[PDB]
């Protein structure tokens, strides 16, 4: 299937405490592989997956330098943005940045992205042509002009289409046992009535990876026809994910409903039915 | 591998 590599950066100002809190994390698909936290003791980019641990000290030192540089850049930004929005030094504010690349089933570049937010709202983002900028307001227009003059988009394009993809492929190969593995969901259906009339059937999906899944309810067939209560896909904590979908059906006539579980780890879509 | 170019202040 397709794959991605993404880095997420958050800086939060802390009036009266000196320096902002900075947290960076990196992912390959749904697997976190690095982290940096400004409040931790190491002051190093740290491994969070087994296969990245084999990178040598040159790699770790470099990643640590770069992540610290991102941190200090955001810290300057926090000051500049406070000015652009005419804010005081009393409030806590947040800067976020995210970037990365997607590759298809052939591991060739599909798309890249680089986006920035202030106080939880879009500030500036690179469009998919990896050349144009979308600026949210007058402040972001000023940033856009500065970044256009410095050819930031050209720099990011060289990283997103070249470096990002080359390293994503390397990681995919080094951690093949982890990242190229597909854990098919373990499924089962649950039963809950309401003393009389209609009941609720809950179709479960557990221990699956990647996170992308589709739990659909059909009535009789063909058309997906049942307003189901589905929870957000959620992490188990062991590297796998969980999800369910429930429909309200009249007592009896339960056999008219079939749960359709779709996931990459399944050669063919799966179908469950309530069995006492 | 994090970006080592294209990261400037706003």
């Amino acid at each position: 299937g397709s794959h991605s590599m993404r880095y997420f950066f958050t800086s939060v100002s802390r009036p009266g405490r000196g320096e902002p809190r900075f947290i960076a994390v990196g992912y390959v698909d749904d697997t976190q592989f690095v982290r940096f936290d400004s409040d931790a003791a190491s002051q190093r980019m740290e491994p969070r997956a087994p296969w990245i641990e084999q990178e040598g000290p040159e790699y770790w030192d470099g990643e640590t330098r770069k992540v610290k540089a991102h941190s200090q850049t955001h810290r300057v930004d926090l000051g500049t943005l406070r000015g652009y929005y005419n804010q005081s030094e009393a409030g806590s504010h947040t800067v976020q940045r995210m970037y990365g690349c997607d590759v298809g089933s052939d591991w060739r570049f599909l798309r890249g992205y680089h986006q920035y937010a202030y106080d939880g709202k879009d500030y500036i983002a690179l469009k998919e042509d990896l050349r144009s900028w979308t600026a949210a307001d007058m402040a972001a227009q000023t940033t856009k002009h500065k970044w256009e003059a410095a050819h930031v988009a050209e720099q990011l394009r060289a990283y997103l289409e070249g470096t990002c993809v080359e390293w994503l492929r390397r990681y995919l190969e080094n951690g093949k046992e982890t990242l190229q593995r597909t854990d098919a969901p373990k499924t089962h259906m649950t039963h809950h009535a309401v003393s009389d009339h209609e009941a609720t059937l809950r179709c479960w999906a557990l221990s699956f990876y990647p996170a992308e899944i589709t739990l659909t309810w059909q009535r009789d067939g063909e058309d997906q026809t049942q307003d189901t209560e589905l929870v957000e896909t959620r992490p188990a904590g062991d590297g796998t994910f969980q999800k369910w979908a429930a429909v309200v059906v009249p007592s009896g006539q339960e056999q008219r409903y079939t749960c359709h579980v779709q996931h990459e780890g399944l050669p063919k879509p799966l179908t469950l039915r309530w069995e006492p | 591998e994090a970006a080592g170019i294209g990261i400037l202040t706003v």
Partner: T-cell receptor, first 115, second 109 residues
């Protein structure tokens, strides 16, 4: 227009004497600042790399320390020089962030430590 | 210096000819590349930089990058005696520059 300037330009000192080198920049704000040392026939080797708010990396030089008392003032010091501290000391700057602006050296400070 | 390798020279080039300076690097995560010129008794001066594959020309200087062979080069057209100097290659290996030891070039008048 940006300029980077270092002082003193050349110095001859005895072993055991203190060292103080200064570097200043103009025309840019919150720059990255670097101290490098270059030996004869070799390329500059990094000693310290400071972002606008503090040190980001250093090759932990044995007998040198750096400080950045102001945004555009960078100092390299030693309390008591060793013979091995002779070299060509170079200050450089780069624009805030990780980009292509700057990467320029000052004039350098040539230090000869004598026994 | 194993991270960035350059032949030391001295390399002689006749005035008017093209001088070719070569550099190889071992740090695979290098994302930008730089050439400096250093005259005797002076600090290095930035000639140019590049962050993409292929050629980049600035007047008489052309920098070339081949990332698959980790090779960077600098070509100097219409070489002049005033081009005599040591040329330093540097890679950005994350927030900083790492240098090779340079190639000393002498352009014969």
């Amino acid at each position: 227009s940006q300029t980077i300037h270092q002082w003193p330009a050349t110095l001859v000192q005895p072993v055991g004497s203190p060292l103080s080198l200064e570097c200043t920049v103009e025309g840019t704000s919150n720059p990255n600042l670097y101290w490098y040392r270059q030996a004869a026939g070799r390329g500059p080797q990094l000693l310290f790399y400071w972002g606008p708010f503090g040190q980001i990396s250093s090759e932990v030089p044995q007998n040198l320390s750096a400080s950045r008392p102001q945004d555009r003032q960078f100092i390299l010091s030693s309390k008591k020089l060793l013979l091995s501290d002779s070299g060509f000391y170079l200050c450089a700057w780069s624009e805030t962030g990780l980009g292509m602006g700057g990467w320029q050296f000052g004039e350098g400070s040539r230090l000869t430590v004598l026994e | 210096k194993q991270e960035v390798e350059q032949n030391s020279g001295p390399l002689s080039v006749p005035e008017g000819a093209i001088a070719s300076l070569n550099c190889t690097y071992s740090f695979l995560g290098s994302q930008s590349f730089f050439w400096y010129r250093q005259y005797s008794g002076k600090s290095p001066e930035l000639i140019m930089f590049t962050y993409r594959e292929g050629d980049k020309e600035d007047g008489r200087f052309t920098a070339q990058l081949n990332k698959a062979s980790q090779h960077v080069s600098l070509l100097i057209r219409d070489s002049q005696p005033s081009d005599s100097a040591t040329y330093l290659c540097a890679v950005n290996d994350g927030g900083r520059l790492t240098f090779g030891d340079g190639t000393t070039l002498t352009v014969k008048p």
